[PDB]
Write a protein that binds this ligand. Sequence first.
Ligand SMILES: C[C@H]1c2cccc(O)c2C(=O)C2=C(O)[C@]3(O)C(=O)C(C(N)=O)=C(O)[C@@H](N(C)C)[C@@H]3[C@@H](O)[C@@H]21
Ligand SMILES: C[C@H]1c2cccc(O)c2C(=O)C2=C(O)[C@]3(O)C(=O)C(C(N)=O)=C(O)[C@@H](N(C)C)[C@@H]3[C@@H](O)[C@@H]21
Ligand SMILES: [Cl-]
Ligand SMILES: [Cl-]
Ligand SMILES: [Cl-]
Ligand SMILES: [Cl-]
Ligand SMILES: [Mg+2]
Ligand SMILES: [Mg+2]
Lengths: 207, 207
Amino acid sequence: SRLNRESVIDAALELLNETGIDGLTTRKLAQKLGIEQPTLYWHVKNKRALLDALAVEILARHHDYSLPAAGESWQSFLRNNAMSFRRALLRYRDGAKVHLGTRPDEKQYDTVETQLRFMTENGFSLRDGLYAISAVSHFTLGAVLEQQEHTAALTDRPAAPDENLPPLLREALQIMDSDDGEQAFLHGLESLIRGFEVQLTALLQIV
Amino acid sequence: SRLNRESVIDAALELLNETGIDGLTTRKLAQKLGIEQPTLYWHVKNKRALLDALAVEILARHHDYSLPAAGESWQSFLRNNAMSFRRALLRYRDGAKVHLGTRPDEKQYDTVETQLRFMTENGFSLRDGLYAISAVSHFTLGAVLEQQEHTAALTDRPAAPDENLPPLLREALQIMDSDDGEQAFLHGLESLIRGFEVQLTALLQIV
Ligand SMILES: C[C@H]1c2cccc(O)c2C(=O)C2=C(O)[C@]3(O)C(=O)C(C(N)=O)=C(O)[C@@H](N(C)C)[C@@H]3[C@@H](O)[C@@H]21
Ligand SMILES: C[C@H]1c2cccc(O)c2C(=O)C2=C(O)[C@]3(O)C(=O)C(C(N)=O)=C(O)[C@@H](N(C)C)[C@@H]3[C@@H](O)[C@@H]21
Ligand SMILES: [Cl-]
Ligand SMILES: [Cl-]
Ligand SMILES: [Cl-]
Ligand SMILES: [Cl-]
Ligand SMILES: [Mg+2]
Ligand SMILES: [Mg+2]
């Protein structure tokens, strides 16, 4: 079919969403596209190339809160940004796995510069701003990852009997599985943001 | 070679550390063990079985701070536990990927019950205790994941030119790569723990 960047990415993203990160192989991508492998190799040289581009395009399509509103608090911005990041990562199977270990792409430079600049404008050093942004990303990535993988592990094998569970775990597990991970994520998110605040506002005060 | 659980796990863990989660295939495990595939299948039925058992055994070997010291603060316990979790996950390649989406194993029940109980003894509801423990796990998993995958992505392809970078990103990237991720992790960890505290101690007070 069509082999421009957009369509290769389209198809890869579909393939990723079907079969996960394990099924995103250049052989299987060729089959989806209805092409031979040397044809695909002209456009895509290897899996890592593809993963990097999927990471970028997942956010370009589905990460709608990359930048703060006018006069937005840094706390509101991080909260909205994280929610948005999470939603984007959850949109495709292994979406979070695809992002891991990437660094911002040239197409993301202005955006991520603005984010970094905004944190500094709000009282953070670059370093402390970056630590906050990293922490929010990492927390969100792990939350999504554990959600997405747990759901995949369910399809493979079942959990063991309820019968053997000690009571707080048994209850913990019901809570965990009472939603998709969203409640615990939002709660963790506010914790995290408030700790940044405690840190920012302490300035030199031992805190 | 020997095909008891311990030795299958030994060899899988070696295989995982060599070739990562992609190379942990029952075919390649058979080759490492020097056995035929039907021989291996008797002991290990599929990849997910193996992943679950590796998740458990990684912590059994290398997660040394699972339980609080006598009279330890919950804040100290989370900090020490997280450090310990991180160290365990970083010990093997894709160690964090292996953990994702698991739930506690029967062999971990007493431990994780004690952890849950301890948080409740320290003022948390089960639910808020679990949200704190989840948040600490997720943050730590994402931190480790992004560290481990970034290092793998380096071996594949290089970062693009420094030349095009806007200045705060350029600086951010040096900071990020000034250590293995540890400084940012520890900083994020204290933020997170202090936000739990703010939340715990607020009780009913709007906070
Ligand atoms: C500042 C970026 C950065 C800087 C240095 C090293 C890095 O690895 C990064 C990132 O990876 C970032 C992202 O991935 C973003 O998700 C990122 O690229 C992104 C975006 N394109 O809008 C975000 O919304 C960010 N958000 C907190 C989840 C986040 C970035 O802020 C950083
Ligand atoms: C309470 C456990 C739990 C409860 C309900 C659903 C879950 O998925 C879990 C976990 O997955 C936990 C872990 O993985 C631990 O890492 C876990 O199993 C573990 C351990 N074996 O010592 C830890 O140190 C924990 N730590 C915060 C990283 C953590 C556990 O507390 C939880
Ligand atoms: Cl074309
Ligand atoms: Cl605001
Ligand atoms: Cl044997
Ligand atoms: Cl203490
Ligand atoms: Mg990133
Ligand atoms: Mg776990």
